[PDB]
Amino acid sequence: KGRPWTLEDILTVPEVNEIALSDNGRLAIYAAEIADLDAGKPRSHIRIVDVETGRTKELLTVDTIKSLRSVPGTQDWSALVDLGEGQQLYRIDTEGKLLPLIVNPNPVPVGKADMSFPLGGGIRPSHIGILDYDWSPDGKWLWYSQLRAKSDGPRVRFDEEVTALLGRRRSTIDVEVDFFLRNPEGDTTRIMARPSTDRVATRGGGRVLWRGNEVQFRIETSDGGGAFEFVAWNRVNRTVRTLAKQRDLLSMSILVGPRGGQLSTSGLGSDRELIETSAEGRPHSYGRVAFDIGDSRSAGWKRSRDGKRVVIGTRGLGDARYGLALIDKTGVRELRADASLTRCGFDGMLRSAICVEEGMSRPPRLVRVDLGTDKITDLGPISPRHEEIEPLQTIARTFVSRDGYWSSGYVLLPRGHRAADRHPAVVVTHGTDADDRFAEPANQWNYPVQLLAERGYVVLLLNDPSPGQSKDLMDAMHAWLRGKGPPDPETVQQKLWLTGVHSFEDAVTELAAEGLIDPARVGIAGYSRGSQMVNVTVTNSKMFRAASSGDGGFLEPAGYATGRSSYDAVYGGAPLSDNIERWRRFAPSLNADKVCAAVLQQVASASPSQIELFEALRAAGVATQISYYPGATAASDETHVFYLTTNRLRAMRENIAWFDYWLLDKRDADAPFPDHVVKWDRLKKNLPDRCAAAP
Amino acid sequence: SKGRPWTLEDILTVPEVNEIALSDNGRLAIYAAEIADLDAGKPRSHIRIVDVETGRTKELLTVDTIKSLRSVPGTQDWSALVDLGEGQQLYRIDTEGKLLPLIVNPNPVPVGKADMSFPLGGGIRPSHIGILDYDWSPDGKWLWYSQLRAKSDGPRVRFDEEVTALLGRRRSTIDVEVDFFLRNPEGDTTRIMARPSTDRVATRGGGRVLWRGNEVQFRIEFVAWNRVNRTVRTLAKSILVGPRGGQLSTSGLGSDRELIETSAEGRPHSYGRVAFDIGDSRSAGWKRSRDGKRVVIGTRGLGDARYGLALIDKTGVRELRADASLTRCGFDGMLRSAICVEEGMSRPPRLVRVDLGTDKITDLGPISPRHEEIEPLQTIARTFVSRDGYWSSGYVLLPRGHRAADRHPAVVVTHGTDADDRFAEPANQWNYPVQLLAERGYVVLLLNDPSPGQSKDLMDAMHAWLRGKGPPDPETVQQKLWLTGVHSFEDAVTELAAEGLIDPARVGIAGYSRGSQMVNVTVTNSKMFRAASSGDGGFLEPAGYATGRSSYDAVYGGAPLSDNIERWRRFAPSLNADKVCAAVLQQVASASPSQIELFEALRAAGVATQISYYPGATAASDETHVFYLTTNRLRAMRENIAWFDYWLLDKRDADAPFPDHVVKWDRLKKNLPDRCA
Ligand SMILES: OC[C@H]1O[C@@H](O)[C@H](O)[C@@H](O)[C@@H]1O
Numbered sequence A: 001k002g003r004p005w006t007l008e009d010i011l012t013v014p015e016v017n018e019i020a021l022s023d024n025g026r027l028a029i030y031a032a033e034i035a036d037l038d039a040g041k042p043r044s045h046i047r048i049v050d051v052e053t054g055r056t057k058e059l060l061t062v063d064t065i066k067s068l069r070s071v072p073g074t075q076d077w078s079a080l081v082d083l084g085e086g087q088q089l090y091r092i093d094t095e096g097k098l099l100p101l102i103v104n105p106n107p108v109p110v111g112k113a114d115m116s117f118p119l120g121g122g123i124r125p126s127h128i129g130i131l132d133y134d135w136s137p138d139g140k141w142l143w144y145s146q147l148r149a150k151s152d153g154p155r156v157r158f159d160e161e162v163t164a165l166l167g168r169r170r171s172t173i174d175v176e177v178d179f180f181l182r183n184p185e186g187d188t189t190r191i192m193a194r195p196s197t198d199r200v201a202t203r204g205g206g207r208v209l210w211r212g213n214e215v216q217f218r219i220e221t222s223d224g225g226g227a228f229e230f231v232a233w234n235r236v237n238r239t240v241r242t243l244a245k246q247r248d249l250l251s252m253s254i255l256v257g258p259r260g261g262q263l264s265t266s267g268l269g270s271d272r273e274l275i276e277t278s279a280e281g282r283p284h285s286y287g288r289v290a291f292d293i294g295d296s297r298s299a300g301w302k303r304s305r306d307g308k309r310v311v312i313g314t315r316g317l318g319d320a321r322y323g324l325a326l327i328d329k330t331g332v333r334e335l336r337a338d339a340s341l342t343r344c345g346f347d348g349m350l351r352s353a354i355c356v357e358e359g360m361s362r363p364p365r366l367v368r369v370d371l372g373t374d375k376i377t378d379l380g381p382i383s384p385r386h387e388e389i390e391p392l393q394t395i396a397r398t399f400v401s402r403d404g405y406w407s408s409g410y411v412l413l414p415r416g417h418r419a420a421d422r423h424p425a426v427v428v429t430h431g432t433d434a435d436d437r438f439a440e441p442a443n444q445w446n447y448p449v450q451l452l453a454e455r456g457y458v459v460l461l462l463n464d465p466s467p468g469q470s471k472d473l474m475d476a477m478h479a480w481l482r483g484k485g486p487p488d489p490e491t492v493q494q495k496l497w498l499t500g501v502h503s504f505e506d507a508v509t510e511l512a513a514e515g516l517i518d519p520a521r522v523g524i525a526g527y528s529r530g531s532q533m534v535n536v537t538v539t540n541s542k543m544f545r546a547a548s549s550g551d552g553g554f555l556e557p558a559g560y561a562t563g564r565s566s567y568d569a570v571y572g573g574a575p576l577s578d579n580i581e582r583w584r585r586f587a588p589s590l591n592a593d594k595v596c597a598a599v600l601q602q603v604a605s606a607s608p609s610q611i612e613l614f615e616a617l618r619a620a621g622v623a624t625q626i627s628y629y630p631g632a633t634a635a636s637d638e639t640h641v642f643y644l645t646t647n648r649l650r651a652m653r654e655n656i657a658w659f660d661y662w663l664l665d666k667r668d669a670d671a672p673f674p675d676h677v678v679k680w681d682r683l684k685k686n687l688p689d690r691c692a693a694a695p
Numbered sequence B: 001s002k003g004r005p006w007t008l009e010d011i012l013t014v015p016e017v018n019e020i021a022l023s024d025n026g027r028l029a030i031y032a033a034e035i036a037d038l039d040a041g042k043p044r045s046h047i048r049i050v051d052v053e054t055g056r057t058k059e060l061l062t063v064d065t066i067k068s069l070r071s072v073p074g075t076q077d078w079s080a081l082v083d084l085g086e087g088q089q090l091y092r093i094d095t096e097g098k099l100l101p102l103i104v105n106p107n108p109v110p111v112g113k114a115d116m117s118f119p120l121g122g123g124i125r126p127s128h129i130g131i132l133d134y135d136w137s138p139d140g141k142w143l144w145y146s147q148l149r150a151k152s153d154g155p156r157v158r159f160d161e162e163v164t165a166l167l168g169r170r171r172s173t174i175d176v177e178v179d180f181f182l183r184n185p186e187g188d189t190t191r192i193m194a195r196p197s198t199d200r201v202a203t204r205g206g207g208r209v210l211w212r213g214n215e216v217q218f219r220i221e222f223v224a225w226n227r228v229n230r231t232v233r234t235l236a237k238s239i240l241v242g243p244r245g246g247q248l249s250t251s252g253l254g255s256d257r258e259l260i261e262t263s264a265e266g267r268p269h270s271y272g273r274v275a276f277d278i279g280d281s282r283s284a285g286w287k288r289s290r291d292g293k294r295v296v297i298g299t300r301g302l303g304d305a306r307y308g309l310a311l312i313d314k315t316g317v318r319e320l321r322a323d324a325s326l327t328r329c330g331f332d333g334m335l336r337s338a339i340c341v342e343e344g345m346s347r348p349p350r351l352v353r354v355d356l357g358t359d360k361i362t363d364l365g366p367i368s369p370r371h372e373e374i375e376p377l378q379t380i381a382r383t384f385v386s387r388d389g390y391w392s393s394g395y396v397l398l399p400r401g402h403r404a405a406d407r408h409p410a411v412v413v414t415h416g417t418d419a420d421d422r423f424a425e426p427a428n429q430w431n432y433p434v435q436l437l438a439e440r441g442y443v444v445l446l447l448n449d450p451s452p453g454q455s456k457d458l459m460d461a462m463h464a465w466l467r468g469k470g471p472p473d474p475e476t477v478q479q480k481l482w483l484t485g486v487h488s489f490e491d492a493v494t495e496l497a498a499e500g501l502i503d504p505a506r507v508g509i510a511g512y513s514r515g516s517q518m519v520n521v522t523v524t525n526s527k528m529f530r531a532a533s534s535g536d537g538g539f540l541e542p543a544g545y546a547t548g549r550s551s552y553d554a555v556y557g558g559a560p561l562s563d564n565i566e567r568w569r570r571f572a573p574s575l576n577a578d579k580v581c582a583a584v585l586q587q588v589a590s591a592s593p594s595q596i597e598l599f600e601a602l603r604a605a606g607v608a609t610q611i612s613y614y615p616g617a618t619a620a621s622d623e624t625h626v627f628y629l630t631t632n633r634l635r636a637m638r639e640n641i642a643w644f645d646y647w648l649l650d651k652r653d654a655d656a657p658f659p660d661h662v663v664k665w666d667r668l669k670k671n672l673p674d675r676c677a
């Protein structure tokens, strides 16, 4: 029959971002990131699979594993793993054991921590011995880069160097990036050194071109006005070159097709056009396609060795299901599957492939795909403990709003649900991330969607209106990234934000007409992008009784000086400029007078924008609470997506108690912070008369 | 021998003495001089013992920091809070000068501005504190000391009022508790209380504690503790106390005042018409004899701007005649003899002993012989009255080799009223080498804000700024506290320029903190100054409202986004950036959002501006509001010289600490908007 959803099952759901296949397709290897209670943070369980037999063997558990590839010229594998001493390049033999490949004796601190380097924009605090690596096609040469802490005295900084320190919450160290090359004889020389201002050099995972006597990779300099800059290292003369191009290089570009040109999906509406644009600019169309292209949530892209076949990850329109598409000179062909294929890996000749089969109602599984016959065979499950959970009832629905734009998403029915039953509702929204995938933390975050359903809630997971359905939305997006118009700021607020409030309202009213939702008790929750939507809805809508905004702060005037270009499209200028009235009408901090609801903030960054929303809401009589979740120690911080099991479990349980209280008038003694329920009773009695219910 | 000119290292190494003590027998005295060490990069205190009759001094040793230097009541020894580099502990000084420890905390907690420390305040460099405060029982047996204990609880999720307090955090911190201990004469220490960090008098608080019978009574944020019963008690419902047991006050205003001792229930008593103001924190302070019949207070004259001593008793008030200012003074218990530090604007620090009976001053010799070598600079005490009738006092510093009819450029240095008779006070001239500029040909005018005690208009505005709300009007608070000082600066410059002293074409203004506000407001509301520098500023800017709300609400009436938005736009210097045709340099240790905003606003307006951010000894520690690092304040003096010489004098040098700037300044000068020419 199955068992219900425990909160720990939401915490222990695995994530597979790394999967690789042998050049002969006989064996494969992957890693499942699982939250560990004893360690308090996620660990990656490395497993080896025999694709022919289907049997799997577990090898080890590391802290992190990244850039998992098969070593050319051998049957072995290479990866960047951290055993707890810092991330180094390791080799994994065909028998499933790992040994060091290149070890940096002095890894540098990275992430949000005291005296670390802000590398990946607030990733986990750790040490990086080896940053990035790539094999030559023959496997003889090895290219790798590693971070080197900058040993130097504290120096007087100046004009632009001070303003970059505006938002510093902790101590930082400066570094440089060293690039090395390893000949077949085992001797390594340093190619060049790049500063910290080079953002492609510090990011890693970049492209590198092995051609002729040269090895080529891309770099960024302070100037690029704008341009594309590359450096080529001659393996013979041992010299360097500098390339500057107006248009980016296709050889170093992702998503290239059999013709050799860039792939894109243009147009809007019911479907898109898949075109291949040559470097000279003449397009080649493969016809009409039902999917989008090139999403990091898809299987990525790979091209064969002859260049006549490519495989691209596809997210279809309206089914929000990830899949594969095959492209040769004849044309595009999709391949059907009952579920979505998110993370994949491919052989050398691009014939056999292995993928992670994922679904909204089904847990991740491993599958082998024969790309010639479009035949997939089921391998063993990934997480068996989620396979024993009885599947919740999940319905995929698209809603149309009063402004004509459609919003996709899913509907979670409570356990034991009977037809024609009214239930309270919780709306969880982050970006486009409601799709066919299993309990993706990038969507539901700390909101226990599956647990809310077990307790009788109807959870509505609803995406933002897809900007690709209309040029009105997409033109506002293009103005958002450009930092200028057209269109004007008043329209940017309508299409990017305010129309989502209508899509949320009109989705609840429609389901209320079905008899599935009690409009009296309903709530909205989201983080990041969803935080903006939550904060804009509760200001511009009276429909929602309670709300939870995870780690927000965009659209508030406090964070302007950091994000000017992102704010200028929305508000048309600075808060104290002549655009001040544009800030008063929209920004939620100044509009708190319009807020009647329970607004809870779960905040890891303690930013001045998150604080300004709380003080403005609290000073207006609104019932509100802010929760600052800390790092593993006072020296570190918490990431955007919480990596600490203790902060995840409580935030989940804090949302359970927050919505059970305001929506359902339900109080629990085993709640994570007991003395709060009396504080919320005081927040209820002190509510303003403005918030009185309709007569 | 006339002497030798000044040097940056002379200004840097000027000693300052905050600790001086005298034995109850008056025969021996001990003090400590804080001097900047080039080798260590930070200042170090030199403990010195003095023979009060002869003036003989010998060097005991050199320590990092020494505080709370006093004499033990029971014997001829001494006790002080000393940090040898292992953290600040409680040390006893032998009668022969040797140092032996008394209370030593094996677990000193880190404090200061730095990573994973505790942010005390006042001002502090990153350091470890084993023992915080101490006091002796009046008989010298029982010992009461305060130490700082780090709270070991793990990281906790914070909540509403806790999170908004983390708004302005630039680093990691720890939370601590204070433990109060009591040491019996038999050598056993027992713990009394434990108090949270929220208590200020227990964290940065002073030395106020009272012994009554068997009870030790100290203040918390009043409580009594019995040494016998071992029981705490919150007692039922002092400082600057005269001989009659009441509060001492100075009432009235103008150029003359009247001493008042208010009776316990408020019956006033006048000691007569008096020529000074009450003792500031920079004066000799206040001390009362255990007899209760003699009280000595530090004084500050009005016309003299000099520090001194006033001795009051049942007879009356006596004003001690001194040719220079007496800043820090050690005393005996009965207030009979005193050893003081004598200094002036042109007068290097000296040691003098004072007999309070006969009011005779006796020179015990200089302090630093290095500054005795320097030939003095001409310093004229001058008072400028503005167009509004308010007067401001200061010193006119003439350049080396100044003759009649000669005119020179000018630089105005202002902090609060810190311009008085004192020798190279770092709290006034800060990082501006006021003495070097005179050697280089400048005419430096050190001018204070208009003396607030001269009018009821100013004192009401200062009261409203401190209270946090009106009356008076926000527009009057802007005019009385700030804009009327710009008029005082303007009228003072015109007074000297008409007299044939300074050239109006080349003149500049410099200041830090309170002087930065007066620099930022002056360059916006006045065109008379070509160049400017503002140290460690950022007040009056909109970025700091969410922290300093209480301070801003009186000036602007409310938040910048409220209906008072128009009040900010007329005044706040970052919003006026297009009114500034001068060159604005910012020397900044805090890298605060209010200082960056003023820079980005001035740069967006085409104004020539630069912000120099000076770091700490490590990336894990910051630099204090007053620079304690030798390298930082050494080239900061060089930067101001290079800044004013380029803009005012159009002079270049390779001695500039940053050679890349002189070219960058050419680009900034060339891109100046058409408004300025
Ligand atoms: O880069 C493409 C990757 O495809 C994967 O399927 C292979 O296992 C890797 O060896 C290869 O690097």
Ligand SMILES: OC[C@H]1O[C@@H](O)[C@H](O)[C@@H](O)[C@@H]1O
Pocket: B321, B322, B323, B324, B342, B352, B361, B362, B363
């Ligand atoms: O002002 C009183 C003066 O008395 C003289 O006897 C001393 O030599 C001076 O040092 C002192 O300043």
